[PDB]
Symmetry: none
């Protein structure tokens, strides 16, 4: 008897419309989430190693907010030493210094 | 209601907690509107999970691996070469060339170019 | 049996029980069930991750991650790439060929005369 009623209540588009309503109540949803939590966490860790999920995360990480956070680290005082180092190396190349010399000869020429 | 409290709990311990329950969820979640509703109800707890994972050093280490992907290296390279970042790069380059060391080297290089020219 | 209040309250008790947890443990071991769960929830998961990046509390965590020694090293290694070194030569050349700098160079020349 009871198997009949709950059959047309939690099984097809009925159940599909039933869960939609029950989960609008955040206490029901909290209890639903609680039973799933451990397994949801395990899956979210596991997906970090899957290439299709990595492609989603890579997309997310190119968001303007992450680009801004990256640019702030790059522009930080702590990171300035690293930028100076490659600038110093670039200027200290004898090949590059030859090009600077060419330009200084052209300025002295005029 | 004792006899019918038993029927309901036993029914739903079979319905939504065995083979039957599993099949329902597997189809419904392919419907992108029911998945929206479902994620919506669960959004609060999902946010808690993702925030907590970002504080977890094991999870952080996995995120670092993805940030080190060649695709993210390419993204960073583009940022470094952007017209935006160019102005900061110019400031660092300008402060270097303007330093007394480089001012001296350039003045020295320049007197050579003039001593030959 | 009021389809709502009553049963909802029963199923609510069952959803945080150990048998509820055992349902999710067993369901999510079936790869097809896991795939449908993951791909089904994907759109909203993305929205959650992008939205969270707009929160200063969460920005602090991503900043902590980017300042990790391993990330610092990766970022420095990118600075050292041929490609970045070539960009950097170009920016230096443009700054040296600048009217500002060309003018100091001519100020150095006359000053030596």
């Amino acid at each position: 008897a009871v198997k009949e009623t709950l059959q047309q209540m939690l099984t097809s588009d009925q159940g599909k419309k039933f869960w939609e309503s029950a989960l609008k109540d955040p206490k029901f949803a909290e209890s639903f989430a609680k039973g799933l939590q451990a397994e949801h966490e395990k899956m979210m860790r596991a997906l970090m190693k899957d290439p299709d999920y990595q492609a989603l995360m890579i997309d997310i990480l190119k968001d303007p907010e992450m680009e801004k956070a990256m640019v702030d680290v790059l522009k930080s005082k702590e990171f300035r030493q690293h930028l100076q180092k490659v600038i110093t190396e670039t200027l200290n190349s004898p090949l590059y210094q030859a090009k600077i010399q060419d330009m200084l000869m052209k300025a002295a020429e005029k």
